[PDB]
Amino acid sequence: WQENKSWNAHFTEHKSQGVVVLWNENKQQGFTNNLKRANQAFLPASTFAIPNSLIALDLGVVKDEHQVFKWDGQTRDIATWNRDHNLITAMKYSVVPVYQEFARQIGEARMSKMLHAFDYGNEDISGNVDSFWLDGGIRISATEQISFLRKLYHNKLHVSERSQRIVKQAMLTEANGDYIIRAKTGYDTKIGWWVGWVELDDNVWFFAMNMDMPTSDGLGLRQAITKEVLKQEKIIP
Amino acid sequence: WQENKSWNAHFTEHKSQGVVVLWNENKQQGFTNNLKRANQAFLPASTFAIPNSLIALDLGVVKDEHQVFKWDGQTRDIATWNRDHNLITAMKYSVVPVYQEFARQIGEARMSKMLHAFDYGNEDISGNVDSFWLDGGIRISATEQISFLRKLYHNKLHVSERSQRIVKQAMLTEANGDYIIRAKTGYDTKIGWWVGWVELDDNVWFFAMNMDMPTSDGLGLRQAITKEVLKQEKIIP
Ligand SMILES: *C(=O)[C@H]([C@@H](C)O)[C@H]1CC(SCCNC=N)=C(C(=O)O)N1
Ligand SMILES: *C(=O)[C@H]([C@@H](C)O)[C@H]1CC(SCCNC=N)=C(C(=O)O)N1
Ligand SMILES: [Cl-]
Ligand SMILES: [Zn+2]
Ligand SMILES: [Zn+2]
């Protein structure tokens, strides 16, 4: 691990504070603007959709990425949530009601055992099974996110290879002639997350970032700040 | 099937001739500028990488999308070919030596049976096992390409679901907040191919196009012409 304090300019020039963590897979080396905050644990918020979807698929709660989850008919504030979804669109739109339904069907016992087998964060599901990742006791740091993501990339998590490929499919966010990004956003009204990886021809760069997000105004800064670091480091054009 | 002769403006305004075929999955309806050429069979050229990779994976010739195929040490004219590749980069760079090696390991007997089970084109492997898709007798039309692609999308081809997901992963070409394109290019010095599909939130549009390509000058017109039709039809922004 290597601290590059010069990356802080990417946060400060947007009047922002936070951390970006990168991991070069081929070289087994990591880089961050702030080593301390890189190991500070936070609520995972919607980034928990990754472990949640893996367990749901492995347990048969979800059949595949095109199976339809019917909207329960309760209208919620996020307009995109009030409709039928599959795994692809549930991830893209961070559709909490779908993931709460996943968690209820999984149950507390299977959830806790599976998170332990994943070595995910602090492994604490207290106390609502359908809302612990939002307002309970589970916490994960940026470096622990990368640790979890590396296992998923290599199909080394303690679930079926098929479950892992399907979740990696659903993580697809961006792709062009130079790179592929699979990732997941999160927001809990206090902090904002962006965790994933960048696939290249001959390497992969894992990333985890979070930042203070007092208001929804600048949620877009999560992706923008990350891409500016990737550009600076010549990872993407 | 419905012929929209107005799409020909997309070819003629580039001094080009060819066909674009689209298929609306949700509505089960197809559209093309030229119904005749839509059913005209051509050499598949590098688009054969899709069936070839499926059979190789199902037979164990390829383990997964990150397994390394060592370059044989013969330098060929395409600079990108003279190096180690995996399934991802073999598809992106259309690396013929890798696919010829696949075909040799598969063999004529298994190749012919598998193409028949796929109902792929005319199902004629004459006569070089490692070069028939380039200069042999196999031929496929644009509508037959879509027929093959629909089965792959639904995991309905006569191979493992795992093999089909891995090939669909390797077909990834482009992705943003509005759509995902999985596809494969082809070029045989006479005609140029672009076959695949566009994934949306709630639908999929399959496509197959080919055009006369006398010189390498305008290979980029394959993607450009296709995207202009998609834009005209309000499939992508
Ligand atoms: C997850 O972190 C949250 C949810 C649990 O509060 C969802 C909600 C949002 S913002 C809603 C509007 N979307 C704007 N893009 C996100 C998010 O990551 O943006 N995740
Ligand atoms: C497949 O159709 C051919 C090969 C069998 O001749 C390959 C070669 C090319 S062009 C080589 C340089 N690349 C430019 N982009 C393609 C192609 O589809 O572009 N496929
Ligand atoms: Cl994918
Ligand atoms: Zn076990
Ligand atoms: Zn059979």
Side-chain angles (χ1 to χ4, degrees), chain A:
Chain A
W1 292 104
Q2 189 184 304
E3 186 176 68
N4 291 351
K5 307 252 259 174
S6 87
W7 290 2
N8 287 325
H10 299 296
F11 287 96
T12 53
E13 85 179 352
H14 305 113
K15 300 191 94 123
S16 295
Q17 145 77 355
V19 59
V20 168
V21 184
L22 305 180
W23 178 263
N24 184 336
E25 185 63 9
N26 275 354
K27 302 193 110 185
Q28 295 285 283
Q29 307 195 237
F31 309 90
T32 181
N33 61 306
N34 184 330
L35 271 165
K36 263 225 306 208
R37 183 168 179 146
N39 290 291
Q40 179 166 13
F42 301 93
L43 280 163
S46 310
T47 65
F48 195 74
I50 302 171
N52 201 3
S53 299
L54 283 169
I55 298 160
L57 288 156
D58 214 63
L59 288 179
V61 172
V62 180
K63 174 183 180 65
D64 59 43
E65 75 279 17
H66 294 332
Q67 180 180 55
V68 175
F69 314 118
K70 304 290 298 177
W71 170 52
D72 67 357
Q74 330 182 211
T75 58
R76 299 168 176 88
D77 291 325
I78 312 301
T80 54
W81 294 2
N82 308 315
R83 64 185 58 165
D84 289 349
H85 286 284
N86 62 34
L87 195 60
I88 306 305
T89 67
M91 287 257 300
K92 165 170 173 179
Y93 297 110
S94 300
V95 187
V96 175
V98 163
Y99 296 111
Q100 303 188 283
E101 172 76 349
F102 292 177
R104 290 193 284 269
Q105 297 300 329
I106 292 166
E108 291 178 5
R110 295 192 293 186
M111 187 57 78
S112 175
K113 297 194 176 277
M114 290 264 206
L115 291 186
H116 178 69
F118 285 170
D119 196 43
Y120 186 87
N122 60 350
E123 305 165 15
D124 191 345
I125 68 161
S126 67
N128 298 334
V129 57
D130 55 38
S131 86
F132 64 94
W133 66 98
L134 312 165
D135 61 2
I138 198 179
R139 313 269 199 272
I140 191 166
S141 71
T143 62
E144 288 167 351
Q145 290 261 39
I146 285 183
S147 171
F148 170 74
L149 292 169
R150 294 191 57 241
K151 299 190 205 77
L152 172 60
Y153 175 87
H154 289 295
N155 300 315
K156 288 306 254 221
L157 285 170
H158 200 113
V159 283
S160 74
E161 170 185 327
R162 168 183 190 271
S163 299
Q164 296 177 75
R165 297 182 171 280
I166 293 176
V167 168
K168 283 182 285 183
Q169 182 191 353
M171 283 162 76
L172 183 53
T173 303
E174 191 179 332
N176 64 17
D178 302 311
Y179 64 79
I180 303 160
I181 292 173
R182 312 186 180 264
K184 183 74 205 74
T185 65
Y187 173 53
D188 69 1
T189 66
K190 183 181 98 225
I191 73 133
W193 277 108
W194 203 35
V195 307
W197 61 73
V198 188
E199 304 183 16
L200 304 182
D201 275 7
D202 45 357
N203 197 13
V204 176
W205 283 81
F206 294 86
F207 67 86
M209 75 90 58
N210 57 69
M211 57 179 294
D212 302 348
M213 188 78 52
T215 90
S216 73
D217 265 309
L219 288 173
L221 289 166
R222 299 171 296 176
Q223 294 94 341
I225 285 172
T226 298
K227 284 178 152 187
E228 291 175 12
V229 170
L230 298 166
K231 260 102 154 192
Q232 177 192 349
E233 299 301 289
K234 281 134 55 133
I235 305 175
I236 63 178

Side-chain angles (χ1 to χ4, degrees), chain B residues 44-47 91-92 94 183-187 193-195 222-223:
Chain B
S46 310
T47 65
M91 287 257 300
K92 165 170 173 179
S94 300
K184 183 74 205 74
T185 65
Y187 173 53
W193 277 108
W194 203 35
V195 307
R222 299 171 296 176
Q223 294 94 341

Side-chain angles (χ1 to χ4, degrees), chain B residues 2-13:
Chain B
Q2 189 184 304
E3 186 176 68
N4 291 351
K5 307 252 259 174
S6 87
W7 290 2
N8 287 325
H10 299 296
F11 287 96
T12 53
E13 85 179 352

Side-chain angles (χ1 to χ4, degrees), chain B residues 59-222:
Chain B
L59 288 179
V61 172
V62 180
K63 174 183 180 65
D64 59 43
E65 75 279 17
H66 294 332
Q67 180 180 55
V68 175
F69 314 118
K70 304 290 298 177
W71 170 52
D72 67 357
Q74 330 182 211
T75 58
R76 299 168 176 88
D77 291 325
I78 312 301
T80 54
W81 294 2
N82 308 315
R83 64 185 58 165
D84 289 349
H85 286 284
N86 62 34
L87 195 60
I88 306 305
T89 67
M91 287 257 300
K92 165 170 173 179
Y93 297 110
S94 300
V95 187
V96 175
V98 163
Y99 296 111
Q100 303 188 283
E101 172 76 349
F102 292 177
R104 290 193 284 269
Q105 297 300 329
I106 292 166
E108 291 178 5
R110 295 192 293 186
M111 187 57 78
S112 175
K113 297 194 176 277
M114 290 264 206
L115 291 186
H116 178 69
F118 285 170
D119 196 43
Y120 186 87
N122 60 350
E123 305 165 15
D124 191 345
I125 68 161
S126 67
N128 298 334
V129 57
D130 55 38
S131 86
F132 64 94
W133 66 98
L134 312 165
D135 61 2
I138 198 179
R139 313 269 199 272
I140 191 166
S141 71
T143 62
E144 288 167 351
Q145 290 261 39
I146 285 183
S147 171
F148 170 74
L149 292 169
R150 294 191 57 241
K151 299 190 205 77
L152 172 60
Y153 175 87
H154 289 295
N155 300 315
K156 288 306 254 221
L157 285 170
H158 200 113
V159 283
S160 74
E161 170 185 327
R162 168 183 190 271
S163 299
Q164 296 177 75
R165 297 182 171 280
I166 293 176
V167 168
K168 283 182 285 183
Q169 182 191 353
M171 283 162 76
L172 183 53
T173 303
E174 191 179 332
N176 64 17
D178 302 311
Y179 64 79
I180 303 160
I181 292 173
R182 312 186 180 264
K184 183 74 205 74
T185 65
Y187 173 53
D188 69 1
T189 66
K190 183 181 98 225
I191 73 133
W193 277 108
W194 203 35
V195 307
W197 61 73
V198 188
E199 304 183 16
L200 304 182
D201 275 7
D202 45 357
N203 197 13
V204 176
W205 283 81
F206 294 86
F207 67 86
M209 75 90 58
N210 57 69
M211 57 179 294
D212 302 348
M213 188 78 52
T215 90
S216 73
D217 265 309
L219 288 173
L221 289 166
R222 299 171 296 176

